[PDB]
Amino acid sequence: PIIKEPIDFINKPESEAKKWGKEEEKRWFTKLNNLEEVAVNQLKNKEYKTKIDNFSTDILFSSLTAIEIMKEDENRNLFDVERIREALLKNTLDRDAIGYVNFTPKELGINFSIRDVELDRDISDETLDKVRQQIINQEYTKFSFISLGLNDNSINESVPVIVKTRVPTTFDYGVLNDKETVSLLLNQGFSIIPESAIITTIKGKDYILIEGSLSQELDFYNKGSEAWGAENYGDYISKLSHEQLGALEGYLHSDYKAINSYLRNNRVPNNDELNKKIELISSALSVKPIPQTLIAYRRVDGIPFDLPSDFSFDKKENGEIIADKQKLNEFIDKWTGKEIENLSFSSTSLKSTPSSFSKSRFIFRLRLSEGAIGAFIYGFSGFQDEQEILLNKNSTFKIFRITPITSIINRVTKMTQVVIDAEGIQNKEI
Ligand SMILES: [Co+2]
């Protein structure tokens, strides 16, 4: 398309942003049906917006079964989320847009106070260094829809972070104009990669100004992909020797209980036959290393975190069941930045929420690097839709962000769970 200077209102009068914002919203709103307009317009309401952003996160980590239950039930939040997505589809950018994406500290895996606790005004250099260490060159996905605030009135003073980025031409968008804020609305699932962070002061208040690239991770959430495995692992079996195939098939079908436990026991007492199988399974998994960086999922219970298996992030309060904020906060503060050791092979799926694991509260969202020793289990008898990626033994999960959610289990059941963002790391013999 024809080249145009980007949308940029940062160094322009407010009235200019307001005029542009009003026409554009009107223009979008005219493209919308009545139900899409109410769903979209209500996002100017902060309680509604929070709720909808929350729900739009929750449904990515609910089983495909729960989604259907909700469709049947005519779930108004799921419907509103679906109407918002559809509304966004009717509008595509003509040019780049420059502005501020609405990431909070928590969404950049920051749990400590950025600003001084008392005045909520100053950021120390030590704090700056600590945030740089957490965020620089790290990729953080916004699960919900994303706002791009178009001028300095969009800066929320209570938020100690300003994330400035560029949205490329051809992306879907809507524009919302309310009460001195002009913003774009954008799709779920974009990431920011922070590239620099300095301290800026506007109106006596300190912010961490972050310049980031907008990107996107290869992530299938609860849908998984039937194409990714065929594309990348369609000829996998044919690349294995007989002994690699046999050893792997054995692990998948019969040996994994024994092998996992032998490995979890630091190989004591020594078992030469198990040693031989393990050697051959590891050997198989490096025949076709992970070909590109992607997200795979492993739901687990409390055990790897030294917690009861039946540990709940929920509590009885006034009759109903609500989130235990205290438990969430303490779990996040203890585990952000920690490494989870996996002595045995680790099972993983392209699907975030296989329904048999609906009640597993700790949802590892694993960045597997290109080159990672593992394989998508394609064409094996019995694995007919698990969409499994088996990772090599000694795969460490280094946690960079922990995001509480309200997973939907069935018509009558919800559950506070945690999305645990980690990188798969292999300090790796074999
Ligand atoms: Co703060």
Domains present along the chain, CATH in parentheses: 1-218 (3.90.176.10), 219-430 (3.90.176.10)
The CA 122 to ligand 1 mean position distance, Å, reads: 10
Q: How close is the Cα of 311 to the center of ligand 1, in Å?
A: 29
**Rounded to the nearest 5°, which phi and psi values hold at 136?**
-70, 120
Dig out the tokens for 234 from the structure: 């369609």
d(CA 404, CA 334): 14
The alpha carbon of 121 and the centre of ligand 1 are apart by a number of angstroms equal to: 9
Sign of the Cα pseudo-torsion (255, 259, 262, 264, in order): negative
Instruction: Using the mean position of ligand 1's atoms as its centre, give its distance from the Cα of residue 181 in Å.
Output: 22
Torsion angle in degrees (nearest 10) through CA of 271, 277, 282, 286: 160
Residues 409 and 415: beta-carbon distance below 8 Å: yes
Q: How many angstroms separate the alpha carbon of residue 159 from the centre of ligand 1?
A: 7
Asked if 166 contacts 214 with a C-beta cutoff of 8 angstroms, the reply is yes
Distance 114 CA to ligand 1 centre (A): 4
In angstroms, this model's resolution equals 2.3
User: 197 alpha carbon to ligand 1 midpoint, in Å?
Assistant: 16
Taking the C-alpha atoms of residue 336 and residue 398, their distance in angstroms, rounded to an integer, is 9
What's the gap in Å between 402 CA and the centre of ligand 1?
17
* Residue whose C-alpha is closest to residue 18's, from 153, 174, 208, 110: 153
In 100-241, which residue ranges form alpha helices assigned H by DSSP?
A: 125-135, 227-233
β-sheet bridge partners, residue 201: 206
Q: Is the dihedral of CA 340, 127, 103, 315 positive or negative?
A: positive
Ligand 1 centroid to Cα of residue 113, in Å, is 4
CA 161 to centroid of ligand 1, rounded, Å: 9
- Tell me, in angstroms, the distance from the centre of ligand 1 to residue 215's CA: 26
Q: Residue 159 class from Cβ within 10 Å (0-12 exposed, 13-18 middle, 19+ buried)? A: middle
| Experimental technique of record | X-ray
Report residue 329 as tokens: 């906060």
Residue 106 alpha carbon to ligand 1 centre in Å = 10
Q: How far is the CA of 162 from the centre of ligand 1 (A)?
A: 12
Q: Burial level of 403, CB count in 10 A (0-12/13-18/19+)?
A: buried
**Cβ atoms < 10 Å from Cβ of 326:** 10
Dist CA 149 CA 140 (whole Å): 18
Alpha helices in 358-405 (DSSP H): none
If you measure from the C-alpha of residue 118 to the centroid of ligand 1, how many angstroms do you get, rounded to a whole number?
Answer: 10
Tell me the CA–centroid distance for residue 47 and ligand 1, in Å. Answer: 21
For ligand 1, the distance from its centroid to the CA atom of residue 198, given in whole angstroms, is 16
